[PDB]
Design a protein around this ligand. Structure first.
Ligand SMILES: [Ca+2]
Ligand SMILES: [Ca+2]
Ligand SMILES: [Ca+2]
Ligand SMILES: [Cu+2]
Lengths: 107, 107, 107
């Protein structure tokens, strides 16, 4: 799975979260977000493969991507604790982090 | 995903398993149990972060957590082989391992 | 999760893909295929554990297994891009790679 596959999975799963009804689905969808972010952890967007693993421009991508992953884990939390709507509220701000990270590296 | 997020996912997925009907769901839910246990493999419960990675008290947590993971894989087995109920019977004993591991490290 | 557990998951998820209707399910099922292939990446089939990690017969298994994983990522693509049927067409050829890899290492 390359970078744009996981990001499109994140964006699609966020739509499944806002349209879900129970806590099992939002926990299921958030875990897929964690799964998609886990598979593309070592991946590189098609914009930065010509920039070094030690370059600040791509290490920006490394902190921003793992910042996305830790916010997902905070959202998986409230879904597991039963707070299904605070998780959906946390998933709404998560879409901001997903949208911003995707736009500056997508096409 | 921290330790208590995965354990609450395990406990919730065990409830989805006993309430499922086919083999695809129990295989789906058991794979999420494997996924939750995989994401929190290197994690540490909020009780032992002040105990060393080489301490016997936390290496107890490392064997007990990976013992949980290998029992999950044995349960993913029977669900994949079509033995949907022997998997649910294996998931019931899996809840014992999940409950015992969670209680001695949860809050 | 051992090797035959993931392969039976792949074979079962391929049946869920051809029977699905939207793009969320096929993306969900394809991500489980990526998940099953990820958990059994370092695993070894019950036929080759008596053959070295540096032997060509098992390194054949290593390239063939990771070739399966990269074809999955190409299938997760079209499902995420909305091309739900080109993904199902890509999942049909994926079953060929799954069947061939499974038969020469299964029992
Ligand atoms: Ca609805
Ligand atoms: Ca029922
Ligand atoms: Ca149908
Ligand atoms: Cu992993």
């Amino acid at each position: 799975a390359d970078w744009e596959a996981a990001m499109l999975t994140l964006l699609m799963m966020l739509k499944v979260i806002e349209k879900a009804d129970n806590a099992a689905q939002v926990l299921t969808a958030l875990w897929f977000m964690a799964l998609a972010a886990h598979m593309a952890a070592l991946a590189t967007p098609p914009k930065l493969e010509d920039k070094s693993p030690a370059s600040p421009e791509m290490i920006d991508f490394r902190v921003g991507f793992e910042e996305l992953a830790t916010e997902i884990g905070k959202a998986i939390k409230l879904a597991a604790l039963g707070k299904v709507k605070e998780a959906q509220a946390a998933a709404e701000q998560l879409k901001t982090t997903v949208n911003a990270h995707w736009q500056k590296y997508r096409s």
